[PDB]
């Protein structure tokens, strides 16, 4: 023939991916990536965080010195893992404001204990019980000293322990609540009285309450656990007439990244910066749907099971160009040219516009993958007991956070998918306009994304057009002859 | 010559700035403004808000009547500033749920106190101590009445104080905890007993707990501070046999905008709506990176040190037009024309498209500047003690709020920058298309943002084109003869 057709177009695939946009809920694209991590490995990693496996021991049991927890003395951790199988196997006890002590120690991150010599004169020391069997012998909590009368006298104690160090000291102590009056006389030889433990800043006074309680491990009595924090320069004074479960020393308090998690997942040999109750997860994707309880550099928890971010063009699967459909036969690039001339048909990709679109997509992906925010100690998110308004507030705060981050994830994905599509349409239009301006008056736009070139144009001519070296003037007279018949 | 070139383009600057967009972490723009207020003035200004400088007093010390806080009697404030240098210089005391009373009074915003005549017969009023020296004489808290025995008798008190007002009455009272039993007999001539303070809607019963405590200012005894709120129509009844630190009257509880802040910044003289612990800050920028603790019409706190909002076009630094580069030699506007014809070179800015782009940018700026959210009383954000579960929840709530607002700020700035660039590129394209349409068939698009005008065209026709008065019919025959060789 005496003319040639040069069509511009873009790639397509046999089976694309459906993504969401602001304007179109289900737009088919050539490629997409998942931004929600929906599965875990099933194992907690030993690295990079120090993991202390509580096994049968709860954090409080380790703190008090339950004999089964002897292996946890003076341990440190970044994350303490509490197992659902843990149980107490020592003298029955309770802790007023248990959650606060558990959080306090979990965030401290250490069970390092320093023994101190308290005067404890006129009373006996190291009381034991058949409930706490250590090495086939009656014992007691390893960090507590159960004081009893000496020779049927228990003189009032007024014991001073100054804090001459540069750190806060955590003292754990308790009060014994005997089952009956005979136990009170047998152990203390007098009425319950009261125990006052004080510092310059605060005081705590606890009275024993004699009475029968349901037997736990055949013990009808209870020990209540109290704690106090002694600041540098302060003094701990213990004023007691009986029923005192004395401290044996102090625990250190540190600031840090330590926390406690409840999980039955096994601990394996792996390296992951994000630990969940379901095991560690990858932290590459900006969002996760595995759990709301996280430690470390974890993706934000969202409700969506999946969020797909377009990383490609509208698919529009199937001469004609981009106006009618995409080209399923392209494998070299995303944008390109197809032609029909005097030699035959052909096709070549336009690699500069393909790379420009890819670089813009790479830009969008860079701002999401590997930008994970790191969090450590947080509120409790799961509860086993009904408590009251504080639990309701903690649940409300977590649900609010989840709803807002799920909204942000949905809006972010819809906006980025809309911009990815608009950019790839823009690149197609820029290539079309570039070709039209280069051809100028030597070709007409046929309305299907193709140009009709009104002159003989061989493969070198088409290649010259594709690579930006077409010389407009060389063919102008011939084209005008064909276009207008002079 | 027989042909003129008319090029269109936009300005550029030798050195632009870098902003973030949806697509590009680093896009160079001609101008950008800072939306994060990263520094304070260093002073807390005394207006528009009423500020009461606590000096050496805490709010509770001023509430109780510590001898050093006499200058704070019956004061009101919008913001109470508590200094890190404040210390107690009176009888040692503790407040169960201290944070709640401090918040309660800070929210009320006043120390206005009305005295009431309580019967207090059979006891000695106005007890004093060497710990509280007021005028080189032993004293006690100015708002408390330390009652002791009269003639070695302390009859049971049953004292009624009806609330016949239309507002809530705040009563501050306490319980004496003697160091020894000898002090209990000396002061009250009898056993500790218990103190019950009640209203129709409530009751509080507190037992004295005699025992030695670490001496604070040489006092081994302590006073516990309790408060009660009496609603209109209710009755305050105090039933006590000893150890009572009686009220002298009541404080008003009012609603308002009052709060308390901890800051060592000097108090300055200016008008600044936003006060932070680091001093007052400007509230023009939508975001701040100064502190977490705020009062007044403050910008939202974000974690970014800087967020730059584009206020100009892509720089595209270096006849030819927009497609190849920008024009660094244009200083009279943002858009314009360059000419090359039979007379020589020329250049003139198009001020209408410059103003349209500026108006759109000014719209975005007006939507983002001076639109702060005024907040007053809020939760405590910094803590000096390890408290447990409640403190952890307060920290979690603030961390969640900050992360969500930082996300919103980052997304908003990226969104505004992408829209600013897209709008000014669209305006450039509108000017190019308007020129092309005006030229009709008398010119060709050369592919670099320039038109080849196929006729002799002096400065008068160029000016006609620039101002929209070019008549293509008068030049049609010449343009067609040169362009198509008729």
């Amino acid at each position: 023939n005496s003319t040639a057709t040069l069509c511009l177009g873009h790639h397509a695939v046999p089976n694309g991916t459906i993504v969401k946009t602001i304007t179109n809920d289900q737009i088919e694209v050539t490629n997409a990536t998942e931004l929600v991590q929906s599965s875990s490995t099933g194992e907690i990693c030993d690295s990079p965080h120090q993991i202390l496996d509580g096994k049968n021991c709860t954090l409080i049991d380790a703190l008090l010195g339950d004999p089964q927890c002897d292996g946890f003395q003076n341990k440190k951790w970044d994350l303490f893992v509490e197992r659902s199988k843990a149980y107490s196997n020592c003298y029955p006890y309770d802790v007023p404001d248990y959650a606060s002590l558990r959080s306090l120690v979990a965030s401290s991150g250490t069970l390092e204990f320093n023994n101190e010599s308290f005067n404890w004169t006129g009373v006996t020391q190291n009381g034991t019980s058949s409930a706490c069997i250590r090495r086939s012998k009656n014992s007691f909590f390893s960090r507590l000293n159960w004081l009893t009368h000496l020779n049927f006298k228990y003189p009032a104690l007024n014991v001073t322990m100054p804090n001459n160090e540069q750190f806060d000291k955590l003292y754990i102590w308790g009060v014994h609540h005997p089952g009956t009056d005979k136990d009170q006389i047998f152990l203390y030889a007098q009425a319950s009285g009261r125990i006052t433990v004080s510092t310059k800043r605060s005081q705590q006074t606890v009275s024993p309450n004699i009475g029968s309680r349901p037997r736990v491990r055949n013990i009808p009595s209870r020990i209540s656990i109290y704690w106090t924090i002694v600041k540098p320069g302060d003094i701990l004074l213990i004023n007691s007439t009986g029923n005192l479960i004395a401290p044996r020393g102090y625990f250190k308090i540190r600031s840090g990244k330590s926390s406690i998690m409840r999980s039955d997942a096994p601990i394996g040999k792996c390296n992951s910066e994000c630990i969940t109750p379901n095991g560690s997860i990858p932290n590459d994707k900006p969002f996760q749907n595995v759990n709301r309880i996280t430690y470390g550099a974890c993706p934000r928890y969202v409700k969506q099971n999946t969020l797909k971010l377009a990383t490609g063009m509208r698919n529009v699967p199937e001469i004609a160009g981009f106006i009618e459909n995409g080209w399923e036969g392209m494998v070299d690039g995303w944008y390109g040219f197809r032609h029909q001339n005097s030699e035959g048909r052909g096709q070549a990709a336009d690699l500069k516009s393909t790379q420009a679109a890819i670089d813009q997509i790479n830009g969008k992906l860079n701002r999401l993958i590997g930008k994970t925010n790191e969090k450590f100690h947080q509120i409790e998110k799961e509860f086993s007991e009904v408590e009251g308004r504080i639990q309701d507030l903690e649940k409300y705060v977590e649900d609010t956070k989840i709803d807002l981050w799920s909204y942000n994830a949905e809006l972010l994905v819809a906006l980025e998918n809309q911009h990815t599509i608009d950019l790839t349409d823009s690149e197609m239009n820029k290539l079309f306009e570039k070709t039209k301006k280069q051809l100028r008056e030597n070709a007409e736009d046929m309305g299907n994304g193709c140009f009709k070139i009104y002159h003989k144009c061989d493969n070198a001519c088409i290649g010259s057009i594709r690579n930006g070296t077409y010389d407009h003037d060389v063919y102008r007279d011939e084209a005008l002859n064909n276009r207008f018949q002079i | 010559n027989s042909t003129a070139t008319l090029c269109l383009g936009h300005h550029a600057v030798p050195n632009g700035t870098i902003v973030k967009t949806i697509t590009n972490d680093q896009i160079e723009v001609t101008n950008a403004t800072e939306l994060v207020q990263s520094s304070s003035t260093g002073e807390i200004c005394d207006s528009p808000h009423q500020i009461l400088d606590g000096k050496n007093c805490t709010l509770i010390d001023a509430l109780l009547g510590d001898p050093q806080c006499d200058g704070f009697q019956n004061k009101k404030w919008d913001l109470f500033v508590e200094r890190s240098k404040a210390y107690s210089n009176c009888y040692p005391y503790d407040v169960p749920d201290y944070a709640s009373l401090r918040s309660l009074v800070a929210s009320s915003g006043t120390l206005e106190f009305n005295n009431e005549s309580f019967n207090w017969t059979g006891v000695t009023q106005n007890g004093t101590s060497s710990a509280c020296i007021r005028r080189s004489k032993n004293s006690f808290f100015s708002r408390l009445n330390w009652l002791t025995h009269l003639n070695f008798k302390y009859p049971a008190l049953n004292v009624t104080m009806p609330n016949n007002e239309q507002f809530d009455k705040l009563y501050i009272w306490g319980v004496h905890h003697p160091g020894t039993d000898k002090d209990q007999i000396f002061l009250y001539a009898q056993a500790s007993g218990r103190i019950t303070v009640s209203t129709k809607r409530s009751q509080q019963t507190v037992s004295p707990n005699i025992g030695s405590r670490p001496r604070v200012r040489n006092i081994p005894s302590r006073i516990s501070i309790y408060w009660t709120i009496v609603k209109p129509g209710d009755i305050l009844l105090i039933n006590s046999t000893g150890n009572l630190i009686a009220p002298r009257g009541y404080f008003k509880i009012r609603s308002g905008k009052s709060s308390i802040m901890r800051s060592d910044a000097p108090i300055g003289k200016c008008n600044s709506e936003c006060i932070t612990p680091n001093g007052s800050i400007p509230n023009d920028k939508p975001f701040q990176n100064v502190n977490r603790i705020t009062y007044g019409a403050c910008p939202r706190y974000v974690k970014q040190n800087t967020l730059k909002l584009a206020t100009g076009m892509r720089n595209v630094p270096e006849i030819a037009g927009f497609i190849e580069n920008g024009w660094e030699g244009m200083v009279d506007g943002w858009y314009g024309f360059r000419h090359q014809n039979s007379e020589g070179r020329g250049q003139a800015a198009d001020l209408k498209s410059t103003q349209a782009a500026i108006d759109q940018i000014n719209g975005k700026l007006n939507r983002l500047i001076g639109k702060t959210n005024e907040k007053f009383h809020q939760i405590e954000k910094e803590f000096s003690e390890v408290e447990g579960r409640i403190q952890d929840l307060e920290k979690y709530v603030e961390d969640t709020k900050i992360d969500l607002w930082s996300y919103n700020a980052e997304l908003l700035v990226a969104l505004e920058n992408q829209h600013t660039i897209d709008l000014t590129d669209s305006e450039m394209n509108k000017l190019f298309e308007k020129t092309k349409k005006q030229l009709r068939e008398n010119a060709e698009d050369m592919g670099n943002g320039c038109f080849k005008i196929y006729h002799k065209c002096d400065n008068a026709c160029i000016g006609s084109i620039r101002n929209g008065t070019y008549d293509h019919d008068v030049y049609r025959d010449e343009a067609l003869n040169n362009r198509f060789q008729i």
């Epitope: 990536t33 393909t354 890819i358 790479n362 | 896009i27």
Partner: antibody, heavy 125, light 107 residues
């Protein structure tokens, strides 16, 4: 994967040097080639990058107007011509695999230069 | 941008932990930073891509980290073969790379 550079060159001031870099073990047009100058002492000065996929280039501002980069797909080679050599340009010149091209990058690996040539040791004056 | 090497590990010995670090004049994405080891007489080889990911076969001791404007190589325990010049690389938005001045880690 291997990159093999040309041998040592000795040039007089005012001359140009063209350093080749032959690739083997990976599709040549799937990645760019970056050129880096290691002067005696001193650190690594990046000189430029060329896309084998589409021919695009990027140059260090200090060398704009002086260095021309080109590729040859059939030989899977890249060339860098440095014009108007001065004695300050004596250095070991390395070629390395650059950015991934034609594929969307999700991993951070493909933003680094993970394959380096031997170094040609070009002496000027 | 421009990177400042601020060398802090010029003289170390086997068994010691390296604290070699790099500060950017502007904050950068962690995905665009990398660490390289250049031995005398050899071309640089890539050690760490991103802020903390190991590239090719490498000893487990070469585990780095960082964020924002401050990145650290953190060599867990040095061996004689680890003494080399270490370079901090930053990738920009454009297909351009910049290197720091180089920290020479020697016996």
């Amino acid at each position: 994967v291997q990159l093999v550079q040309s041998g040592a060159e000795v040039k007089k001031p005012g001359a140009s040097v063209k350093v080749s870099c032959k690739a083997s073990g990976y599709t040549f047009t799937s990645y760019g080639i970056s050129w880096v100058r290691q002067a005696p002492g001193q650190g690594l000065e990046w000189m430029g990058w060329i896309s084998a996929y589409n021919g695009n280039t990027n140059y260090a501002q200090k060398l704009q107007g002086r260095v021309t980069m080109t590729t040859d797909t059939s030989t899977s080679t890249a060339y860098m011509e440095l014009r108007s050599l001065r004695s300050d340009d004596t250095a070991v010149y390395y070629c390395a695999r650059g950015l991934l091209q034609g594929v969307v990058i999700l991993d951070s690996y493909y933003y680094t230069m993970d394959v380096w040539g031997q170094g040609t040791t070009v002496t000027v004056s | 941008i421009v990177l400042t090497q601020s060398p802090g590990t010029l003289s170390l010995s086997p068994g010691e932990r390296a604290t070699l670090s790099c500060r950017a004049s502007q904050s950068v994405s962690s995905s665009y930073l990398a660490w390289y080891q250049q031995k005398p007489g050899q071309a640089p080889r890539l050690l760490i891509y991103g802020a903390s990911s190991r590239a090719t076969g490498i000893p487990d001791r070469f585990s780095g980290s960082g964020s924002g404007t401050d990145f650290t190589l953190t060599i867990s325990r040095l061996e004689p073969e680890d003494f080399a010049v270490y370079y901090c690389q930053q990738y920009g938005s454009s297909p351009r790379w910049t290197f720091g001045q180089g920290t020479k880690l020697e016996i």
